[PDB]
Amino acid sequence: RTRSESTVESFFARGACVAIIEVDNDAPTKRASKLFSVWKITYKDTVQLRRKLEFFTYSRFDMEFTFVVTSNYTDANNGHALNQVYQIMYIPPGAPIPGKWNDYTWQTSSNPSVFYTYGAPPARISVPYVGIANAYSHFYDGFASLNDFGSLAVRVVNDHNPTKLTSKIRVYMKPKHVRVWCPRPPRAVPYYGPGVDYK
Amino acid sequence: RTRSESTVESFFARGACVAIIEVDNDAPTKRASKLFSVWKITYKDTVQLRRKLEFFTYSRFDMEFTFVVTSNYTDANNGHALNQVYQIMYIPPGAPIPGKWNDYTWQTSSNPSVFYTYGAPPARISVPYVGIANAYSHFYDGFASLNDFGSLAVRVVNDHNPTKLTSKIRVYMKPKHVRVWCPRPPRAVPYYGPGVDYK
Amino acid sequence: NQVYQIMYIPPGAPIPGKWNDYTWQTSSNPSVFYTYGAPPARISVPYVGIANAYSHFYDGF
Amino acid sequence: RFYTLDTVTWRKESRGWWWKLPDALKDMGLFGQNMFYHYLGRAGYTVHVQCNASKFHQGALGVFAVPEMCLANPGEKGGEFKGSCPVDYLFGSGVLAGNAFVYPHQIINLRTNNCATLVLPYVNSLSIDSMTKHNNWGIAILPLAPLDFATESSTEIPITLTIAPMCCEFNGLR
Amino acid sequence: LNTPGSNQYLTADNYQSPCAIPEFDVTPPIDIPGEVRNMMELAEIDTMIPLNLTNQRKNTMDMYRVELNDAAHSDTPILCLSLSPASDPRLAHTMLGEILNYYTHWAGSLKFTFLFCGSMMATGKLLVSYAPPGAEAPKSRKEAMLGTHVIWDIGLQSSCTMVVPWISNTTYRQTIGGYISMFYQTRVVVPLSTPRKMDILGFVSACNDFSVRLLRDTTHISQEA
Amino acid sequence: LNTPGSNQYLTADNYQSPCAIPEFDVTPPIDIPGEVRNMMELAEIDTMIPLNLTNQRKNTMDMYRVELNDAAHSDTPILCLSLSPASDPRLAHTMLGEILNYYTHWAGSLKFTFLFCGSMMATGKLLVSYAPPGAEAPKSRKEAMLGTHVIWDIGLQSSCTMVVPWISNTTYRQTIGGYISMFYQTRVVVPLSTPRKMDILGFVSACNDFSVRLLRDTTHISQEA
């Protein structure tokens, strides 16, 4: 035992990309012009973090989210565009999910939001323990894998611009203050779905 | 009773969008080319904040204003424009309201003003208690709903530019040091006008 | 504005072979994102040797 | 008190047995009545496994206490593992049976002992929870070694499972 | 390096701000009666329950009361209340329901007060029973008698107060827990020409242990999009 | 001046972050059994070795055991284990191997436990030898006898535990060290009609001095590109 770099905090608190969000600005032309996508915060999208968390039954940790936004000009000769401003809103568990770009959910009455300006250092937010139970449940035998975690929504708040722009937002989640309980053996078969089914 | 997140400060001190201001630069071409709009600071424009404040008769709080400016090129192929500078001026109660872009009210002899540069972090100002009475009056039975609060004016101070630009300013107001008196029951019917009329 | 990803590969880790391979997910490889126009990126790599000191000469197998 | 479940028989082709708690005790007299009459509850378990094997019998049994034994509700009799109905070597969760020893466990080697005991503390994400729609613990008995015996007598070794609740708490009478 | 949270406005941000009007003579406060520190003050105030929601008795005054003396009555629940203040329409419009509509999660005990408004000469008995969570509401007097219940006497006593304890596996449950029903016990007896159409009123309030977390938006009055 | 490390997101960065939900009522923790501080807790837990990897005995239950009584047996190693937990397939799938797969370097002693499952009346002797690192595994009983070895008796004793010491020039070696082999000593003797096909089980675990550094990614289950 003993020695550093082998602790639970060292094992779990590592930054990794967990989601990619595609947003547009205006001028659909021939595309759907998706202004937002919305992503439910979960650890099932990354195999490494999923395998690390499945090693235990109950866990408690805080989530630190880092957003990196990279914009691209679809047409090289559309003209210089004004600097883009992106709105990243955290949706707490139990809150309504946005369905339209200009709906009431984007008013940030109770949903935390951060505005990111292109060229600025990447946005960073910290989400504390938002679970309903005393610890997150990776396994539930009965009638809890969906341990809330809220969701993230990113949209462009710029005005109507004739030019076409596409931006990609990389979401990095770094767990903090990780505590684990009830050790479990590692997964030995490839994952199929969000459950424990095997083939 | 007891427990946090239920206090008056927690209930009221939440950021929300309360106003949207449209400004132009030059070259009307076919539009009115509104260089300023001016907005009277009030809580009647947002249903959530209005309902929260109507729960009590008298209240005292300080207002923190955050301005987010997003510019847009009306024509995609007008050419690169110089970085825009916006002037946001707070009009104290009882002060004259600007009527022209280059009138005497924009000289900031006694009206606080802040200059915002595009690409910079969003401007933030704090307005203390500017009421005339000892507390704001949400209800008045006699011969006080217009509890001053001053007003905000935003204009573009850039020189004559052939290119056409349109900018939108989002105003977020976060009450601070909120104290309330004389609790009142919640509103049960949709609002019609700035009064208490019901249908 | 261009964004560049600079990733440090620790000894014994796989070397990237494709732009969109698994090695760029930074599961255990430290990485820093640099934005054009920002001050130059700076990182510090401690002693990552296996022995007690780096060997500039080795006479043997 | 001590509650004894139905006796299972060990064969030479048995792939193992599994039980769920407090699912196995839902109909076990007073404890089952209390867990049915209350919306919330909390209680520990004491697991005793008895193997009625003679000195001439060969084999080993692996008793594992798995918290939240999710499988990819029989009740008293439980179920059996499948050779190729959870998979025995996959432990019902796609995990090699060798790593199943991470859970609290006991080894019943017929050449050393014929009984084993286990202490199961209350494990859950809540201080108190319903005793009916949630399975707090699972008991899995696996044939670590194939059953063999002298060519003299017997074909089936009886296996007795006794579970006794402890630290019982009940709230929300209905 | 540009990272989220740097040079960006955050809704839940908290730093110091420049003063627009420095050295301003702020009016000193005065001791205005009714100062409130916490929103839980409103939840502990008794609020009349709209109880009898019917098509005639909706958005009116007759809904707040239930007639307590029919001709031959019945052995069926005259009124039934569900322990879902943020979900039951009979309790969503109350002060407790309005407070809970702003918070996803809630915890603590509840208090229900029932008082009937009739003549002093009216005599009778009523049965008030509390159904534990997860149990169906009683459909008869015997079923109510099988569980936790109290006997309410019509006479010198005119008000009955019951407290529903906090029974939940989790510390806080979502605002998205048992039943309270009343039954006739023997009969309602009145003297000569005494009105046989007296009425009852219900009140709901929160206890001292009430607490909420994770403030959200309200459903009533929403037009902004 | 723009330099690397300024205004850029770093994977191994550590500063304070703005709170998305300030003054949130975080649920207090409870004493959940099985709290673990360090990943080395899992490495010290005994894990059954898949030992006999064969084409019939693969991804099944028969691989975990080796039959210990043939008809005439042989003077050859019945089973051989290599001291490469992160490289040997017989030890890569164990808990120690899975833990080591996440770390490039490792150090410390190892513990191997062998127990056989047969009848109490079975009597015999077995030879367990440890080959020093850099030495070929013995191919005969005499070669095993020439090195470090122990005599395991089949009888009242049913389990044998051996500890492999930490022998390496460097403080930590890569997860990319000797052999452990067992030999028949005299014979396996059983009484009348006693089964002559008893089985043995192997277990591997880490010692208290085990330590790893330079955490890496795992090989099992990788599809992201």
Author numbering:
A (entry chain A), B (entry chain A): 70 to 212, 232 to 287
C (entry chain A): 152 to 212
D (entry chain B): 62 to 133, 148 to 159, 174 to 263
E (entry chain C), F (entry chain C): 5 to 180, 187 to 235
Excerpt from the publication:
In this study, we investigate the production, antigenicity, thermostability, immunogenicity, and structures of VLPs derived from PV serotype 2 (PV2) wildtype strain and thermally stabilized mutant (wtVLP and sVLP, respectively).
Our cryo-EM analysis revealed that the PV2 sVLP closely resembles the native mature virion in the capsid region, whereas the PV2 wtVLP adopts an expanded conformation similar to the EC or 135S particle. Structural comparison revealed that the two-fold axis channel, formed by VP2 and VP3, is markedly opened in the wtVLP, whereas it is closed in the sVLP. Collectively, the increase in the number of ordered parts of capsid proteins and lower B-factor suggest that the sVLP is more structurally stable than the wtVLP. Despite the yeast-derived wtVLP also possessing a reasonable amount of D-antigen, it fails to trigger a neutralizing antibody response in vivo, likely due to its poor thermostability especially at 37 °C, the normal physiological temperature of mice and humans.
